[PDB]
Design an enzyme around this catalytic site. Sequence first.
Site, PDB file in Angstrom:
ATOM      1  N   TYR A 162       0.866  -1.215   0.000  1.00 25.19           N
ATOM      2  CA  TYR A 162       0.000   0.000   0.000  1.00 25.19           C
ATOM      3  C   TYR A 162       0.883   1.239   0.000  1.00 25.19           C
ATOM      4  O   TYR A 162       2.082   1.105  -0.081  1.00 25.19           O
ATOM      5  CB  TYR A 162      -0.910   0.021   1.248  1.00 25.19           C
ATOM      6  N   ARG A 170      -6.894   2.544   3.194  1.00 26.07           N
ATOM      7  CA  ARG A 170      -7.702   1.352   3.084  1.00 26.07           C
ATOM      8  C   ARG A 170      -6.875   0.134   3.537  1.00 26.07           C
ATOM      9  O   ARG A 170      -7.387  -0.979   3.520  1.00 26.07           O
ATOM     10  CB  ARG A 170      -8.063   1.165   1.609  1.00 26.07           C
ATOM     11  N   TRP A 177     -11.967  11.583  -3.276  1.00 26.29           N
ATOM     12  CA  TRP A 177     -10.550  11.447  -2.874  1.00 26.29           C
ATOM     13  C   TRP A 177      -9.548  11.838  -3.992  1.00 26.29           C
ATOM     14  O   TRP A 177      -8.432  12.258  -3.693  1.00 26.29           O
ATOM     15  CB  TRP A 177     -10.204  10.007  -2.440  1.00 26.29           C
TER      16      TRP A 177
HETATM   17  N1  LIG Z   1      -7.043   8.192   1.534  1.00 26.06           N
HETATM   18  C1  LIG Z   1      -7.968   7.599   0.784  1.00 26.06           C
HETATM   19  C2  LIG Z   1      -7.965   7.769  -0.605  1.00 26.06           C
HETATM   20  S1  LIG Z   1      -6.843   8.723  -1.388  1.00 26.06           S
HETATM   21  O1  LIG Z   1      -5.465   8.197  -1.378  1.00 26.06           O
HETATM   22  O2  LIG Z   1      -6.654  10.072  -0.738  1.00 26.06           O
HETATM   23  O3  LIG Z   1      -7.192   8.804  -2.855  1.00 26.06           O
HETATM   24  C3  LIG Z   1      -8.972   7.092  -1.323  1.00 26.06           C
HETATM   25  C4  LIG Z   1      -9.975   6.286  -0.740  1.00 26.06           C
HETATM   26  N2  LIG Z   1     -10.951   5.663  -1.446  1.00 26.06           N
HETATM   27  C5  LIG Z   1     -10.972   5.268  -2.732  1.00 26.06           C
HETATM   28  C6  LIG Z   1     -11.802   4.166  -2.963  1.00 26.06           C
HETATM   29  C7  LIG Z   1     -11.935   3.628  -4.234  1.00 26.06           C
HETATM   30  C8  LIG Z   1     -11.227   4.215  -5.297  1.00 26.06           C
HETATM   31  S2  LIG Z   1     -11.410   3.557  -6.766  1.00 26.06           S
HETATM   32  N3  LIG Z   1     -10.159   2.841  -7.173  1.00 26.06           N
HETATM   33  O4  LIG Z   1     -11.724   4.625  -7.761  1.00 26.06           O
HETATM   34  O5  LIG Z   1     -12.560   2.597  -6.747  1.00 26.06           O
HETATM   35  C9  LIG Z   1     -10.388   5.340  -5.063  1.00 26.06           C
HETATM   36  C10 LIG Z   1     -10.252   5.881  -3.769  1.00 26.06           C
HETATM   37  C11 LIG Z   1     -10.044   6.088   0.731  1.00 26.06           C
HETATM   38  C12 LIG Z   1      -8.993   6.771   1.492  1.00 26.06           C
HETATM   39  C13 LIG Z   1      -8.991   6.602   2.965  1.00 26.06           C
HETATM   40  O6  LIG Z   1      -8.106   7.213   3.591  1.00 26.06           O
HETATM   41  C14 LIG Z   1      -9.989   5.730   3.667  1.00 26.06           C
HETATM   42  C15 LIG Z   1      -9.968   5.575   5.063  1.00 26.06           C
HETATM   43  C16 LIG Z   1     -10.896   4.749   5.726  1.00 26.06           C
HETATM   44  C17 LIG Z   1     -11.855   4.064   4.967  1.00 26.06           C
HETATM   45  C18 LIG Z   1     -11.905   4.242   3.584  1.00 26.06           C
HETATM   46  C19 LIG Z   1     -10.969   5.057   2.929  1.00 26.06           C
HETATM   47  C20 LIG Z   1     -11.050   5.217   1.456  1.00 26.06           C
HETATM   48  O7  LIG Z   1     -11.989   4.599   0.866  1.00 26.06           O
END
Ligand SMILES: Nc1c(S(=O)(=O)O)cc(Nc2ccc(S(N)(=O)=O)cc2)c2c1C(=O)c1ccccc1C2=O
Lengths: 198, 198
Positions: free
Chosen positions: A7, A13, A103
């Site tokens: 990661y 996540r 995000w």
């Molecule tokens: N930091 C992030 C970031 S990001 O790095 O800043 O982009 C992204 C993120 N979701 C995410 C989920 C799916 C996709 S996709 N591939 O499009 O399907 C892209 C981003 C999360 C977190 C969390 O911190 C987090 C903390 C606790 C529970 C869930 C999440 C969390 O879901």
Amino acid sequence: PNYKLTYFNMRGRAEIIRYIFAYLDIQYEDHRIEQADWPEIKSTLPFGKIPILEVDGLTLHQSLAIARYLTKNTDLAGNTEMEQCHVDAIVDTLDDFMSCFPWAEKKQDVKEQMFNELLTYNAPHLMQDLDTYLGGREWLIGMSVTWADFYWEICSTTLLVFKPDLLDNHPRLVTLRKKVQAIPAVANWIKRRPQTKL
Amino acid sequence: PNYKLTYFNMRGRAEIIRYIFAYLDIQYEDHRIEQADWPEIKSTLPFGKIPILEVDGLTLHQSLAIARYLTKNTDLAGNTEMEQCHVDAIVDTLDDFMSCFPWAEKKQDVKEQMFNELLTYNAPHLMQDLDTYLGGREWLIGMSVTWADFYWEICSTTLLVFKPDLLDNHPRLVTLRKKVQAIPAVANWIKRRPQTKL
Ligand SMILES: Nc1c(S(=O)(=O)O)cc(Nc2ccc(S(N)(=O)=O)cc2)c2c1C(=O)c1ccccc1C2=O
Ligand SMILES: N[C@@H](CCC(=O)N[C@@H](CS)C(=O)NCC(=O)O)C(=O)O
Ligand SMILES: [Ca+2]
């Protein structure tokens, strides 16, 4: 088995897998990559996404799928089939909300407005449903901690960065956080993990 | 047990559960509500979402948590714990995608351009990943059908409503769809079911 978790250097996540290894006192390689590494790391993923966990040479993916795999036949699972279903359901209810956040939005002003709207207009309905679900019980499911309590603590830790007063009307949800954070294997991980914004 | 499913009159998020019931030969009440009944019923649900499934008077929620509860100890689960993780992982990958789509969004051109973005740029990447993941195997996981195969059939059906050329470069994904739709209890359900858009 030999375990390698891949990661970013963030909680994000992967953090739910890290708590479960801590609690269960399982050794593993916590491999944290840099942005500069991403194109190369990516070309090796089944679906272009992290976390992955490699287990004796074989690749697992999807953070919740992995967390469930690690907790099977342990005290973190839920005692009964029905409680297992409840554990899953609370985790998905939390994950659905975290997934609403933009995000990856490039424009900071638009990203910030949308975060502010979700936290002000949508979050309080979820916090109230969770509070009511919890009641005066010690843990969200059953009589002892499960990985749904972990995930509540993990998700509310990140939301509280963006909305400090998130839990001002829900002191029972704060208590649950504090109970998760006092479990000795988990306190220990919280104290020693790399300090990252997210 | 005595089973009652409550969802809108659509396939949507409940369909995975209807396929599971069909295949396992389980009787259940397929309760479909009207927009006009919702506000009233909604206010009674633990987290204000459907589908719910009531099992001998007890309420379960979250469609994939329910799907997992029903398939546990059946031959729709994978054959090892590692294989059950790959089933949950495929389902989450597909659910993450379907969930990106702004289903409820009420501006036709923020909605209409988002659909085109995901359908023009993201979908082909996913279709390609799934195809590579399948290779020339008969089923997504292991040597027989699992509910991940069911979810692929269900997901690709709605995706094909918005993008009928989706699977042009992917004949093997089409052959998987047909292996599923050929299963007698599933075939029986598909002809028998209400015809809805989604
Ligand atoms: N930091 C992030 C970031 S990001 O790095 O800043 O982009 C992204 C993120 N979701 C995410 C989920 C799916 C996709 S996709 N591939 O499009 O399907 C892209 C981003 C999360 C977190 C969390 O911190 C987090 C903390 C606790 C529970 C869930 C999440 C969390 O879901
Ligand atoms: N991941 C959840 C999603 C639950 C959900 O948001 N369902 C929608 C319909 S597909 C709903 O009940 N929302 C309507 C509303 O809240 O007004 C599940 O699959 O059960
Ligand atoms: Ca999810």
